[PDB]
Design a protein around this motif. Structure first.
Motif, mmCIF file in Angstrom:
data_model
loop_
_atom_site.group_PDB
_atom_site.id
_atom_site.type_symbol
_atom_site.label_atom_id
_atom_site.label_comp_id
_atom_site.label_asym_id
_atom_site.label_seq_id
_atom_site.Cartn_x
_atom_site.Cartn_y
_atom_site.Cartn_z
ATOM 1 N N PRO A 99 0.828 -1.210 0.000
ATOM 2 C CA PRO A 99 0.000 0.000 0.000
ATOM 3 C C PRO A 99 0.858 1.255 0.000
ATOM 4 O O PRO A 99 2.074 1.222 0.201
ATOM 5 C CB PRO A 99 -0.811 -0.111 1.297
ATOM 6 C CG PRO A 99 -0.630 -1.522 1.768
ATOM 7 C CD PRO A 99 0.709 -1.951 1.266
ATOM 8 N N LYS A 120 -4.434 -1.770 3.005
ATOM 9 C CA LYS A 120 -5.011 -2.450 1.860
ATOM 10 C C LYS A 120 -5.370 -3.881 2.233
ATOM 11 O O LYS A 120 -4.809 -4.458 3.169
ATOM 12 C CB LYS A 120 -4.041 -2.434 0.668
ATOM 13 C CG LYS A 120 -4.706 -2.625 -0.676
ATOM 14 C CD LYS A 120 -4.305 -1.536 -1.652
ATOM 15 C CE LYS A 120 -5.162 -1.591 -2.907
ATOM 16 N NZ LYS A 120 -6.604 -1.390 -2.595
ATOM 17 N N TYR A 170 -5.444 -7.573 0.492
ATOM 18 C CA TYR A 170 -4.997 -8.393 -0.631
ATOM 19 C C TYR A 170 -5.622 -9.775 -0.454
ATOM 20 O O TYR A 170 -5.010 -10.683 0.112
ATOM 21 C CB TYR A 170 -3.469 -8.453 -0.697
ATOM 22 C CG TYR A 170 -2.820 -7.097 -0.857
ATOM 23 C CD1 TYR A 170 -2.781 -6.469 -2.093
ATOM 24 C CD2 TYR A 170 -2.256 -6.440 0.229
ATOM 25 C CE1 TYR A 170 -2.193 -5.228 -2.249
ATOM 26 C CE2 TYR A 170 -1.665 -5.195 0.085
ATOM 27 C CZ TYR A 170 -1.636 -4.594 -1.159
ATOM 28 O OH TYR A 170 -1.051 -3.358 -1.318
ATOM 29 N N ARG A 221 -4.233 -8.640 4.927
ATOM 30 C CA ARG A 221 -4.365 -7.205 5.129
ATOM 31 C C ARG A 221 -2.995 -6.633 5.459
ATOM 32 O O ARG A 221 -2.320 -7.130 6.367
ATOM 33 C CB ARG A 221 -5.360 -6.903 6.255
ATOM 34 C CG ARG A 221 -5.610 -5.431 6.453
ATOM 35 C CD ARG A 221 -6.478 -5.145 7.666
ATOM 36 N NE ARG A 221 -7.854 -5.592 7.480
ATOM 37 C CZ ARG A 221 -8.456 -6.496 8.246
ATOM 38 N NH1 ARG A 221 -7.806 -7.042 9.267
ATOM 39 N NH2 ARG A 221 -9.712 -6.841 8.001
#
Length: 493
Positions: A339, A345, A347, A351
């Motif tokens: 991020p 973010k 994924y 996280r």
């Protein structure tokens, strides 16, 4: 057997040699500075295709990219029709008789020097081949036998008659390599029972760390090229299986469809999406130096970022080493799998939070927080180290890489129960193999001190057996210069 590779040969030498002793479909590879050429015969003519290695892969122009030259030859020998201009066929590999690339060939070397070196470094079965002092043109094979006045060194003359080599009776061989292979499997026996067994050649590469400054100069007036080519000739011993990478379900998970992970060292992902057909694959290998381990993987694709963070979480890794920009020379080499600074973010099931970014001269440190979505007590800090100043096509000075590896090794060592150091670039070999190999070498020197035995090609071969690793001679020379520079700064007292 890789004998299709001719080290010391010119272009017209290859054409005449393919026309006089070859047919349509014959081929050979030749080096000449930094790239290679594959000369192929076709319909009475000879065509020259070029392979360029910038340190990331072998790029046959107009074709595919490969990890080794043997993989390139093997692929186009099985995939006739994809090497075109008119169709070009790789049928018959033309073998080379030059034995300079062999480990057991010492070239110009006297008889007493061979007895001394076989005494100091050789054990039972250690052998070598040298040019004969007594008679020109001929050769001598000296082999050590005994137990480990309980041993001896036997010299065997190998006379050269009409471009053929023999022991003085029996079979006549086309090359010294064929003679060595035969009498290695069918060993000569003295008239008193003792058998001249050719076990392993002499190691002319194990170097003591304190003498690195002299050996680099001995290879500088080319010594580096000769030693690298000897190491390259052993790539045919590392043709392990890659069946999981060649699966049609994993085709879109590789940055390059012919640079695949070994099945015996690849990273197998667990606890994956049951709806996905194959969710255990990732272009990565566990690199175990044979004290930290490594994971050599490719640059992330947009469809492999979630699997990448699955791998880091599963392997409990805490440190990532990126040795390439996202985009180099206009082409994408690794998508941004992290991020933005201060962002968070998701994924897939993982996280990641980017806590802080610290900019050094040659790299950027990013403190990331990897956690499992919907789970507590899974968060851990992953320190991503992104080297940003590596040239597009090696660094002229190894000071930045050594400082980079020193800070990386100190952070990895400070986290208990930390997994392998994930190291990646574009394809995962070349730059990645260079960083991992250097890190292994300086780790030995950091622990055992400046009085320890190292062996760059042997260590590389050990690492190449786990991932199909170092790419060019420049990286090979850079590894030596990095080891030399590390010894030089450690001895400042």
């Amino acid at each position: 057997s890789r004998r299709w590779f001719h080290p010391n040969i010119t272009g017209v030498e290859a054409e005449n040699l393919l026309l006089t002793r070859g047919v349509d479909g014959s081929f050979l590879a030749r080096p000449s500075p930094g790239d290679f050429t594959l000369s192929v015969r076709r319909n009475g003519a000879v065509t020259h295709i070029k392979i360029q290695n910038t340190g990331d892969y072998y790029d046959l122009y107009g074709g595919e990219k490969f990890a080794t030259l043997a993989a390139l030859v093997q692929y186009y020998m099985e995939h006739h029709g994809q090497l075109k201009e008119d169709v070009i066929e790789l049928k018959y590999p033309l073998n080379c008789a030059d034995p300079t690339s062999e480990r057991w060939f010492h070239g110009h070397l006297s008889g007493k020097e061979a007895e001394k070196l076989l005494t100091e470094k050789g054990k039972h079965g250690s052998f070598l081949v040298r040019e004969s002092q007594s008679h020109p043109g001929d050769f001598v094979l000296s082999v050590r036998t005994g137990d480990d006045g309980k041993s001896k060194v036997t010299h065997v003359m190998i006379r050269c008659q009409e471009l053929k080599y023999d022991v003085g009776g029996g079979e006549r061989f086309d090359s010294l390599t064929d003679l060595v292979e035969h009498y290695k499997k069918n060993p000569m026996v003295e008239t008193l029972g003792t058998v001249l067994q050719l076990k392993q050649p002499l190691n002319t590469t194990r170097i003591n760390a304190a003498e690195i400054e002299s050996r680099v100069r001995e290879l500088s007036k080319q010594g580096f090229w000769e030693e690298f080519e000897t190491l390259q000739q052993q790539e045919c011993k590392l043709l392990y299986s890659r069946k999981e990478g060649q699966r049609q379900e994993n085709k879109n998970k590789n940055r390059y469809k012919n640079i695949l992970p070994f099945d015996h060292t690849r990273v197998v992902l667990h606890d994956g999406d049951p709806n996905e057909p194959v969710s255990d694959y990732i272009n990565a290998n566990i690199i175990m130096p044979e004290k930290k381990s490594y994971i050599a993987t490719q640059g992330c694709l947009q469809n492999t970022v979630n699997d990448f963070w699955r791998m880091v979480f599963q392997e409990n890794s805490r440190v990532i080493v990126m040795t390439t920009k996202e985009v180099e020379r206009g082409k994408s080499k690794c998508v941004k799998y992290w991020p933005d600074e201060y962002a968070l973010k998701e994924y897939g099931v993982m996280r990641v939070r980017n806590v802080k970014e610290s900019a050094a001269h040659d790299y950027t440190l990013r403190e990331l927080k990897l956690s499992k979505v919907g789970q507590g007590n899974t968060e851990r800090t992953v320190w991503q180290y992104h080297f940003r100043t590596w040239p597009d096509h090696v660094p002229s000075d190894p000071g930045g890489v050594l400082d980079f590896l020193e800070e990386v090794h100190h952070k990895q060592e400070s986290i208990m129960d930390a997994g392998p150091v994930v190291v990646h670039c574009s394809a995962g070999i070349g730059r990645t193999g260079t960083f991992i190999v250097i890190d292994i070498l300086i780790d030995i020197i950091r622990e055992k001190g400046v009085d320890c035995d190292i062996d760059v090609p042997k260590t590389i071969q050990m690492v190449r057996s786990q991932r199909s690793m170092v790419q060019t001679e420049a990286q090979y020379r850079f590894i030596y210069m990095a080891v030399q520079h590390y010894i030089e700064t450690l001895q400042r007292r």
